[PDB]
Amino acid sequence: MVQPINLIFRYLQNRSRIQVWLYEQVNMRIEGCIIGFDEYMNLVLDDAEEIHSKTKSRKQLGRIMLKGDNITLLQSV
Amino acid sequence: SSKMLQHIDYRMRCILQDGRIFIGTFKAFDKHMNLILCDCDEFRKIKPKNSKQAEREEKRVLGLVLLRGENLVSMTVEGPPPKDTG
Amino acid sequence: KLVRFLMKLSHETVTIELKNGTQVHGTITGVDVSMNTHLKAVKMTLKNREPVQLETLSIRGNNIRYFILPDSLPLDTLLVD
Amino acid sequence: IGVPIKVLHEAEGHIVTCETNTGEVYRGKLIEAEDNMNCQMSNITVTYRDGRVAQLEQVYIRGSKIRFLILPDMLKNAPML
Amino acid sequence: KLPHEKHHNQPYCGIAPYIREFEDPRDAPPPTRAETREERMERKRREKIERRQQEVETELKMWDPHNDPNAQGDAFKTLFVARVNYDTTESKLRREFEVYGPIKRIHMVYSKRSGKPRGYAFIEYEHERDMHSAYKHADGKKIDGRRVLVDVERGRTVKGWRPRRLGGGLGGTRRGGADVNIRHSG
Amino acid sequence: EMTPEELQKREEEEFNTGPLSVLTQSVKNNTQVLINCRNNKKLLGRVKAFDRHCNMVLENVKEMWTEVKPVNKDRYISKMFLRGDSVIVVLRNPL
Amino acid sequence: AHPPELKKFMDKKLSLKLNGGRHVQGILRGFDPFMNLVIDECVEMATSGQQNNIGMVVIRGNSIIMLEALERV
RNA sequence: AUACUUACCUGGCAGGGGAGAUACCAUGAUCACGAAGGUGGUUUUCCCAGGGCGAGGCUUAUCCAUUGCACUCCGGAUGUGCUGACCCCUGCGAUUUCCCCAAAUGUGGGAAACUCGACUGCAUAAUUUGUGGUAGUGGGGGACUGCGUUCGCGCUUUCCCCUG
Numbered sequence: 001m002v003q004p005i006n007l008i009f010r011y012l013q014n015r016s017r018i019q020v021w022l023y024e025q026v027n028m029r030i031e032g033c034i035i036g037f038d039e040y041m042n043l044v045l046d047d048a049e050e051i052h053s054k055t056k057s058r059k060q061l062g063r064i065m066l067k068g069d070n071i072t073l074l075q076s077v
Numbered sequence: 078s079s080k081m082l083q084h085i086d087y088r089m090r091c092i093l094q095d096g097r098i099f100i101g102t103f104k105a106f107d108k109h110m111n112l113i114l115c116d117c118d119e120f121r122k123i124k125p126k127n128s129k130q131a132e133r134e135e136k137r138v139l140g141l142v143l144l145r146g147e148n149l150v151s152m153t154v155e156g157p158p159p160k161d162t163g
Numbered sequence: 164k165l166v167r168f169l170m171k172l173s174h175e176t177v178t179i180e181l182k183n184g185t186q187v188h189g190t191i192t193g194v195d196v197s198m199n200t201h202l203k204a205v206k207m208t209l210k211n212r213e214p215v216q217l218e219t220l221s222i223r224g225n226n227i228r229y230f231i232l233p234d235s236l237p238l239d240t241l242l243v244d
Numbered sequence: 245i246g247v248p249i250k251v252l253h254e255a256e257g258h259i260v261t262c263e264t265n266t267g268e269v270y271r272g273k274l275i276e277a278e279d280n281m282n283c284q285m286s287n288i289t290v291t292y293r294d295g296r297v298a299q300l301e302q303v304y305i306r307g308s309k310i311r312f313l314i315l316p317d318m319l320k321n322a323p324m325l
Numbered sequence: 326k327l328p329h330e331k332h333h334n335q336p337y338c339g340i341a342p343y344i345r346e347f348e349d350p351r352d353a354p355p356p357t358r359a360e361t362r363e364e365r366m367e368r369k370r371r372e373k374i375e376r377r378q379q380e381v382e383t384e385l386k387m388w389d390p391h392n393d394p395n396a397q398g399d400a401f402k403t404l405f406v407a408r409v410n411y412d413t414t415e416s417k418l419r420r421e422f423e424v425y426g427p428i429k430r431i432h433m434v435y436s437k438r439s440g441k442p443r444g445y446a447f448i449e450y451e452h453e454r455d456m457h458s459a460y461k462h463a464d465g466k467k468i469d470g471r472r473v474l475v476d477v478e479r480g481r482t483v484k485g486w487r488p489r490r491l492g493g494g495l496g497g498t499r500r501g502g503a504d505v506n507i508r509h510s511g
Numbered sequence: 512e513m514t515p516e517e518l519q520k521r522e523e524e525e526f527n528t529g530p531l532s533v534l535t536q537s538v539k540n541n542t543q544v545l546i547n548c549r550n551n552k553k554l555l556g557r558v559k560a561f562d563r564h565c566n567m568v569l570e571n572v573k574e575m576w577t578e579v580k581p582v583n584k585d586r587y588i589s590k591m592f593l594r595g596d597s598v599i600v601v602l603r604n605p606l
Numbered sequence: 607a608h609p610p611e612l613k614k615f616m617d618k619k620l621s622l623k624l625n626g627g628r629h630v631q632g633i634l635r636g637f638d639p640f641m642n643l644v645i646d647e648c649v650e651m652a653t654s655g656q657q658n659n660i661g662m663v664v665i666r667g668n669s670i671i672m673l674e675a676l677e678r679v
Numbered sequence: 680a681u682a683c684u685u686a687c688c689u690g691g692c693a694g695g696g697g698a699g700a701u702a703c704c705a706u707g708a709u710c711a712c713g714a715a716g717g718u719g720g721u722u723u724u725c726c727c728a729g730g731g732c733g734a735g736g737c738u739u740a741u742c743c744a745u746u747g748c749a750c751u752c753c754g755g756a757u758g759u760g761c762u763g764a765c766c767c768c769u770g771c772g773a774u775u776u777c778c779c780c781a782a783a784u785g786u787g788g789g790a791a792a793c794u795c796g797a798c799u800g801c802a803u804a805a806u807u808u809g810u811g812g813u814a815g816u817g818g819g820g821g822a823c824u825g826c827g828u829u830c831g832c833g834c835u836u837u838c839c840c841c842u843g
Contacts, residue, residue, distance in 0.1 A: 002635055004642045004664045023669060024329060024812050026626045026653075040805050041666065069806070072624060074664040075650075080193040080201045081221065093311075094226060094813045096183065096209075104325060107246035108797080109808045110199070110223055115320055122212070129819050129842090139261075141320065143248055143313040145281070147808040148265075150181065151207075151222035164800095165562040169592075171726085182549070182597065184815030184843095196799095197809040198594075210815055211843050225811070228550065230592035238568060238590075242560045243362060244698080244726085245797095265813075266625070266671050267327055280807050282610050290672075293327060301678035304615065306641055308807040309671050328813055329626050335551065335578070335816040340602060343553045343575060346543055349606040353541040362699075370716090377715060395711045407709050437712035447711065480710040490714040499708045502718035511709065517693050517800060549814050564810060578816070596810040625812090640806050668806035 008037055011076070021072035027053050030066060041068025081106055086158050089114075092150040097121050100155050101142060110146025117142040168241060170194040178231035179222070184210040187220065198224025245279055247324060251315070253277050254322065260285075261314035262305060267293040270305065271314075281307025381491055391481050395432060398449040402429075404456050405478035407445030410469035421468055422448050426455020447478060465510055474511040522563055533603055534561045546593065547600040552576035554593065565595030609639035614679045620645070622665065623672040627653075631676070632663070641667025 011018050012034050019031040020043065029052070032045025048061040089103040091112060098121075101114025119137040170193070178188045179200070189205025201221045208214040261271040262283060272288030284304045291297055390396075396403075409418070419428055433446040450456045456477070463475035476495075479486045487493035497505030514521055526535055537544050537558045545555045546567075556572030569592070575585045612634070621631045622643070632645030643665050650658040 002644060003638060004636075004644055007644055007662070007664060021628075024626055026628055038805095042805090067805095068666070069668065069812095071666050072626070072628070072669045073630065073666075075660050076662065077660075078195075084221075094183065096813095099312075104320070105247045105251075107248050109246065110197075111246065111248040111808080113248055113251060115317065124211075124818055126818075139314050140317045141315045143252065143315060145310060145312060145808065146223065147225060147308075147811095148311045148813085149223055149808095150183075150226040151187075151220050153217045153220040165560065165564070165566055168560075180550075180815095182811075182814065184550075195809085199809090208843090211817065213843095224809070225596075226813090227594055228548075228597050228814090229594055231588055232590045232592060234589045236590055238559050238570070239361070242568070243360075264671055266329075266623070266627075268623075268672065270672070276611050278610065279608065280610075282807080284611070284614075293330075300674045302614075302675035303672060304610075304612065304675075305672045306667065306670055306807075331814090331816095333814090333816070337547075337549075337551050337599065337814080337816095338577075340545065340547055340553055340600065343545065343555075344605075345555070346545070346604040346606060357541050358539065366699095373715065390710085393711055405710055408707090411707080432711070434711050439712085441707095443712075444707070445709070445711085474709070476709065478710055486710080488710055488714085489708055490712095492714085493710090494714095495709045497708085499706055499714095499717075501716095504718095507706090512802070515692080515801065519801075549811075551814070551816065564804065566810085576816090594810075596804080597814085642806085666806065670806095 008034070008074075011074075012036065017077055019075040019077075020066065021075075023070045023072050029053075032064070035063075038068075041071060042066065043068070043071070084154070087154050088156045088158055089152045090155045091144055091152045093144075094148055094150055099139075099142065099144060101139075102158065103152070107146075110149055112144045112146070112149065112152070114139075114142045114144065116140060166194070166196050166198060167244065169198065169200070171241065172232070175233065175236075177233070180228040180231075181222075182226050182228050187222070189217075189220065195224070198227055200224075200227075249279050249281075250324065251319060251322065252281070252283075252313070253279075255315045255319055258316055260316070263311040263313075264305065265309050265311055270303065272300075272303070278307070281310060283307065283310070283313070384491070390487075395434070396447070396481065397432075398430060399453065400478070400481040402450055402453045402456055403478050404448040404450065404459060404463070404475065405445065405480075406448060406463065406473060406475050408471065408473045409444050409446060410471045411442040411444060413469050417468070418446060418448075421466070422459065422463065425450075425459035425462060427451040472510060476511055525563075526561075531561075531563070531565070533601060534558055534567060537603060543604050545602045546598055547602075548593070549597040549599060550576070556588075556591075565598055567593050569593055607639050610637065610641060612637045612641075612643075615673070615675055618675050618677045618679055619647075620673050620675050620677075622670055622674075624665075625669045625671060630663075630665070638667075641670055643667070643670070643673075 015033050017031050018034050019029055022028045022030070028050065030045070030048055030050055032048040035044045035046055037043050042065060044063070044065045045061075046063055048064045048066075050059040050061060051057070084103060085105065087103050088100070089112075091099040091101070091114065093099060097119055099114060099117050099119055101117030104113040104115055106112050117139045119139060120134055123133045123135070125131075125133065172191050173193060174190060176188070176190050178186060180186055186208045187202065187205055188208075189202035192201050192203045194200045199222060201219065203219050204216075205218075205220045206214055206216045207220065256274055256277045258274055259272065260274045260283075261269060262285070263269045269291045270285060270288045272285040274283060275286050276282075276284035282304070286302050288300050288303050289297060290300065404422075406418075406422070415431065415433065418433070419431060422428060422431075427450065428448055429451045430449045431446060432449075434443040435441065436443060448459075450459075459475060460477060463473075466473050466475070474496075480488075496511060498507065512519065512521060526532060534544075536542070538560065541557060543555060543557055545553055547553050553575050554569070554572050555575070556569045559568040559570060561567045569588075570590050572588045572591055573585060574588065575583065577583050615634050616637075617633060617635065619631065619633050621629060622645070623629055629651045630645070630648050631651060632648030635644050635646055637643050644662065645665065646662045648660060648663045650660070652658070
């Protein structure tokens with residue numbers, strides 16, 4: 001039985017660009033290569049890109065962190 | 078904590094976070110404030126977008142209801158409990 | 164903690180605002196650790212509604228926005244504990 | 245446990261209604277109940293905020309995301325009440 | 326309406342247009358910084374500590390530990406016994422501490438004003454070797470039903486040594502609660 | 512917590528050196544502070560006490576907000592009790 | 607810290623409701639006391655009719671509102 | 680029926696009003712008389728923290744008697760809903776053992792023992808209620824645009840007013 005913690009650890013080792021959805025925001029999304037995570041579900045990315053469905057513009061942010069409560073859905077590549 | 082114990086079985090009106098008013102027989106509660114209402118009716122205030130008309134009330138009968146304390150704002154006694162005497 | 168100070172304001176008059184813009188003015192009779200307060204002989208004023216005088220009202224602590232205490236309250240003496 | 249929780253556990257197996265924070269109201273037969281208000285239902289009828297309805301076969305709902313629940317009035321005859 | 330479908334006609338704005346604080350030179354009232362039943366206790370706690378500390382300097386200059394008429398004999402030979410029962414007769418203290426060696430002189434201290442027995446005495450053996458034999462054996466002895474401790478008297482041997490009243494000494498029978506066990510001995 | 516003992520004083524050092532020290536120095540020096548709450552309104556006043564929950568005891572406060580042309584509205588409250596959850600941002604006198 | 611009794615929906619095609627009016631659909635493989643679910647063959651199911659399959663994904667229980675089983679368990 | 684070794688099945692930690700004053704008790708303090716403080720008592724003022732005593736006092740009917748000459752309130756009793764000074768315990772529902780008072784199998788006091796309560800503190804502001812993405816951010820009456828139109832309206836752009 002695969003759990004989210006073990007799966008998140010796999011994505012981390014793989015360094016794949018994981019996309020994340022925002023809490024209460026459908027129009028905004030974030031994607032980046034995860035570097036680490038804590039029990040609070042907070043995720044840190046090496047190179048983040050803020051993409052909007054309406055604007056389709058990818059804003060470069062770099063090494064950043066994101067709150068776990070704001071996470072809504074994880075997506076691979 | 079007699080402030081709440083004294084009010085068991087009374088006809089209390091629960092105020093919801095969304096603005097609704099649940100009037101029912103307050104049966105029991107808990108530390109989380111989860112109440113049990115009997116013969117509850119739901120009221121909601123709708124704004125008049127057509128003209129200067131009286132506020133529109135839409136009653137709705139529910140019966141027995143269990144309200145989560147997190148969604149409960151406040152509660153007051155609308156009237157005494159249903160008298161069983163003739 | 165600080166909620167203990169809130170439980171000491173029984174029988175005094177204050178004006179509390181709610182997260183939905185509702186204002187409630189009345190005398191306090193009891194408060195709990197969850198910030199839930201019971202006010203007797205209280206008057207409620209919902210947003211875009213008419214004021215109404217309620218003889219009692221038990222409010223939860225989560226939906227509270229802030230309180231308005233009297234001008235003569237002894238803070239230095241009441242905050243010792 | 246809490247008395248409201250016990251009234252919910254004994255209500256297992258009967259038709260109950262559940263409203264969520266997103267406004268949806270679910271009415272159907274209750275399958276499983278838990279202390280944390282997690283409820284499992286079957287053959288429910290959902291009502292959206294707009295008014296449209298839909299059909300489902302087997303559904304589970306988180307407890308924290310429930311506004312309130314409607315149970316059979318006959319439960320008032322419980323021994324605790 | 327729902328929190329997600331609510332049309333925010335006036336969402337949360339910043340605070341850039343709301344900086345209207347008071348000027349710097351308009352400092353706050355200096356006398357409005359104090360608290361009751363928090364500093365007066367510390368103020369009284371500091372004086373009693375300092376008052377004694379100042380009183381300590383006066384006693385050291387007046388009284389000399391080494392130059393004590395009661396104290397006699399070689400310091401390395403003399404022994405110190407405390408926690409002794411008040412009912413212990415002088416002969417009982419001799420016969421119990423003579424097993425380790427002959428006692429040249431024995432001095433039992435008494436209250437200066439009350440005259441009551443202090444509970445500790447100084448034992449002077451004839452030979453320095455006889456004392457050391459008691460250091461290990463005497464410690465932990467049971468005299469008159471009450472355990473007693475025994476250590477070489479440091480009043481005139483150890484550099485920088487002083488008794489309780491001067492902040493030194495050993496044993497914590499009256500130290501912080503639940504910090505010094507009564508069963509353990511020196 | 513990391514210190515499950517009941518004698519833990521983690522909260523003590525936190526308010527003295529942690530981010531919540533902004534309120535301690537405010538009550539110490541009796542300096543004003545502007546707070547942005549979930550009401551979309553800004554509250555400027557002094558502080559007298561607080562705790563870990565970010566609940567401050569304010570006095571001589573001035574509420575300010577705007578509706579809609581955009582019209583500003585302000586009032587005064589000499590003594591009030593602010594909750595923490597409804598707070599968004601806090602700003603001491605930058606002087 | 608009692609976990610939810612989601613053993614019934616294990617290895618079943620479900621359709622989950624999210625907070626911001628978003629919905630997904632996939633086969634469940636595991637859960638946690640906090641309702642953190644890992645579903646495979648998941649579709650985004652955006653507001654429009656378009657469909658986008660990505661496969662294995664993770665969902666936080668704090669955002670899960672309701673979950674219905676299309677296979678009736 | 681007792682003790683010993685193993686497997687299996689059940690379970691959350693700290694506690695017992697709080698802040699001041701204690702000259703006096705205990706701790707009989709490890710240095711030639713001594714600590715202070717602290718800890719555990721006893722004494723002593725309070726936020727009164729809950730109770731027990733209900734004297735006194737407040738509201739109104741029922742019953743009884745009075746034809747009364749006062750100007751310092753007030754005839755007697757029951758019922759409804761209240762208040763309440765002074766004086767007592769600092770708070771346990773249950774169980775176990777020692778000593779003692781005793782109307783001696785009961786009625787009580789001085790000691791602890793470790794046992795349940797959902798009493799409190801921390802895990803409790805880190806997803807499931809006790810610290811927010813439920814913000815409250817409007818509505819209406821007159822003049823004032825456009826698109827579609829079933830001419831009722833949906834969306835959209837302006838000024839002055841009543842309303843919260």
